[PDB]
Amino acid sequence: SWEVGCGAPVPLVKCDENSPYRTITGDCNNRRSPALGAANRALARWLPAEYEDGLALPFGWTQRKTRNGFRVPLAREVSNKIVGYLDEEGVLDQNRSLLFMQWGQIVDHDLDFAPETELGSNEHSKTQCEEYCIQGDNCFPIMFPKNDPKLKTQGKCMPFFRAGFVCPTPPYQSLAREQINAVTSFLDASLVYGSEPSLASRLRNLSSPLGLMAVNQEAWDHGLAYLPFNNKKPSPCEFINTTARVPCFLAGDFRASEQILLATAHTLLLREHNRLARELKKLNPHWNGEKLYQEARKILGAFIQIITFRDYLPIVLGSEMQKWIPPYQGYNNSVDPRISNVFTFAFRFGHMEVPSTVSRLDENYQPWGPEAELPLHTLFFNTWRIIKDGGIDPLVRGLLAKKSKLMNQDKMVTSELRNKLFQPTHKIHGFDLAAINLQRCRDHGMPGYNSWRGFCGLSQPKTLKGLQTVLKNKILAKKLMDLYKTPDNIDIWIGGNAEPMVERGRVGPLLACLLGRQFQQIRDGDRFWWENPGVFTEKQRDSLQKVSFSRLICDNTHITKVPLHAFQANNYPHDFVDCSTVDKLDLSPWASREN
Ligand code: HEM
Ligand SMILES: [Ca+2]
Ligand SMILES: [Cl-]
Structure with missing residues (x-):
């Protein structure tokens, strides 16, 4: 029946109709249905959850209950046999910078986060999910197949805890278990400011009346601000170099310090806030802090939306962009703004x-120091390499002049993430991002590959040759069906990512359909989208259309040469221009007079 009710880990929020800025939580963006898009609600289902028992237990849980008549292959076996590779030569994308990879993680972290259940803290369950590898409740451990090198050096499993879900959190029964989104579904710079108002206030400098964002008081980057430290322990950033004992950064997203370039990107965004806030004050000296914060928070929001929709999504989706994300026709309040x-x-x-x-x-964009180049795995929850070894300018330079990995059917995920991922809670550089993603698809009751091909109106191959034709790879198709036995069983993550790339893009048909459809929804479903008439003056909107990641860098670093298009492959000095050449973000149109 209509279980539209379910949602009692939530207060619910009276909405002040006339309010001219967004909530921190995302509530009230939709007027008829205010909870839509807002953080700490269930991820939307584009298709019904598929669980071993049609309730919550994930496929592969019971050493006995098949899927469509076959065992599901161990997550890590899939990783070992399909996802892994050795030779890093020839793998870099000759036309996407490292900034391309980095903006993807920025935008992702803005949109969705299903944290693990934090019941299991104040409990041994953490430590003997770890040591004993005993599957129970929300401990869903990743078992190693026969002849797995980690069998020799790391024991039987890598640990894994199930994602938080709505209504209950420990207790029984489900309409069907739906995982939570802990951040605002709107592309709203929630990774900068927060999705809970608790943390949002904590990120603000309320001392000044300038509505500035809090900055580091312990340490500075040639005068330019750093993020404030998360001063609460344990800190996995302390754990990786105790000599340095430099904690993780505090941002509106929990994951800001997962790797050193994400914290770099976060630090550019903070400075951009305070840059915008204290520039408005010059222009409009009467405006209090609450209006400096919110009006700068409103511009940062739109910057992210422009860079994403004008420069990122186009070079991700390619041929398929115009089919999914045609020109803005205005707010449709009947659009579901939720992340699926x-x-x-x-x-x-x-x-x-x-x-x-x-x-x-x-x-001069040349190797900085004698360890200019570092293995990615040494940079997980590494904040000291920024504070005690050069600042962000050396790191932002690499972002511009170094290349993204080109996805590759026989070189899918670097060993840096497939074998040497560091997890905040544990103690080794020993985890497998790829096997994690596969385990997580099951944890979330993900439909198989063909359900999602079906969803997007593409072929549902049932044969080895059917699958050879789609993946355009005899060996990949052979390896996948040796493991899964039917394309119906292939986990969506490795399914989507096995397809060749659509033209002038970096994803295959299935993922372009799924991605395109969601960004279409994130734009059309937002009352406060920057092009939506009312949100901004016409004069503001012509002055916002000239933003660039190039610009952002020039204004928030001591870097002076930048490419005109920061996402394509840019070599120094040919493709780099001086900063007096880009186009400033002019805030003349933000002048409040008086009455
Ligand atoms: C380490 C990790 C990265 C880089 C060094 C990295 C990078 C990205 C990019 C570039 C993404 C998009 C373009 C992206 C998306 C998502 N990630 Fe991922 N990522 C690193 C590590 C992780 C870890 C750990 C997780 C958690 C996975 C789990 O189930 O435990 C992770 C997740 C995601 C994710 C899902 C977010 C969510 O809603 O929970 C992306 C959309 N990444 N990453
Ligand atoms: Ca958001
Ligand atoms: Cl879904």
């Missing part, structure tokens, strides 16, 4: 775009 559960896996295409090294580049 499948999208949180479609957007994980990013993982095959991450290369095995990160470089630091001097003012």
Whole structure:
């Protein structure tokens, strides 16, 4: 029946109709249905959850209950036999910079986050999911297949805890278990400011009346601000170099310090806030903090929307962009603005775009110091390499002049993430991002590959040759069906990402359909989208259309040469221009007079 009710881990929020800015939580964006898009609600289902028992237990749970008549292959076996590779030569994308990979993680972290259940803290369950590898409740461990090298050096499993879900959190029964989205579904810069108002206030400098964002007081980057430290322990950023004991950064997203370039990108966005806030004050000295914060928070929001929709999505989706994301026709309040559960896996295409090294580049874009180049795995929850070894300018340079990994059917995920992922809670650089994603698809009751081909109106192959024709890869198709036995059983993550790339893009048909459809929804379903008439003056909107990631860098670093298109492959000095050449974001149209 109409179980439209279910939702009692939530207060619900009286909406002040006339309010001219967004909520932190995303409530009230939709007037008829205010909870839509808002953080700490269920991920939308584009298709019914598919669970071993049609309730919550994930496929592969019971050593006995098949899927369509076959055992599901161990997550890690799939990783080992399909996802892995050795030779990092020839893998880099000759036309996408590292910034391409980085903006994908930024946009993702803005849109969706299903955290693990935090019941299991104040409990041994953490430690003997770890050691004993005993599957129970929300401990869903990743078992190693026969002849797995980790069998020798790491024990029997890598640990894994199930995603948080709505209404209950420990107790029984489900209409069908729906995982939570802990951040606002609207592309709203929620990774900068927060999705809970608790954390949002905590990120603000309320001392000044300038509605500035809080900055580091311990340490500075040639005068330019850093994020404030998360001063609460344990800190996995302390754990990786105790000598340095430099904690993780505090941002509106929990994951800001997962890797050193995400915290770099976060730090550019913060400075952009305070830059905007204290520039408005010059222009409009009467405006209090609450109006400096919100009016700068409103511009950062739109910057992200422009860069995403004008520069990112076009070079991800390619041929397929215009079919899914045609010109803006205005707010449709009948559009579902929610992130879907499948999208949180479609957007994980990013993982095959991450290369095995990160470089630091001097003012002539040459190797900075004698360890200019570092293995990615040494940069998980690494904040000290920024604070005690050069700042962000050397790191932002690499972002511009180093390349993304090109996704590759026989070189899918670098060993840096497939074998040497660091998890915040555990103690080894020993985890497998790829096997994690596969385990997680099952945890979330993901429909198989063909259900989603069906969904997007593409062929549902049932044969080895049917699958050879789609993946355009005799060996990949052979390897997949040796594991899954039917294309119906192939986990959506590796299904989507196995397809060749659509033209002038970096995803195959299935993922372009899933991704395109969600960004279409994120735009059309937002009352506060920057092009939506009313939100901005005409004069503001012509002055916002000239933003660039190039611009953002020039204004928030001591870097002076930048490419005109920061996402394509740009070599120094040919493709780099001076900063007096880009186009500033002019805020003349933001002048409040008086009465
Ligand atoms: C380490 C990790 C990265 C880089 C060094 C990285 C990078 C990306 C990019 C570039 C993405 C998109 C273009 C992207 C999307 C999503 N990721 Fe992923 N990522 C790293 C590590 C992780 C880890 C760990 C997770 C959690 C996975 C789990 O189930 O435990 C992770 C997730 C995601 C994700 C899902 C987010 C959510 O809603 O929970 C993406 C959409 N990444 N990453
Ligand atoms: Ca958001
Ligand atoms: Cl879904």
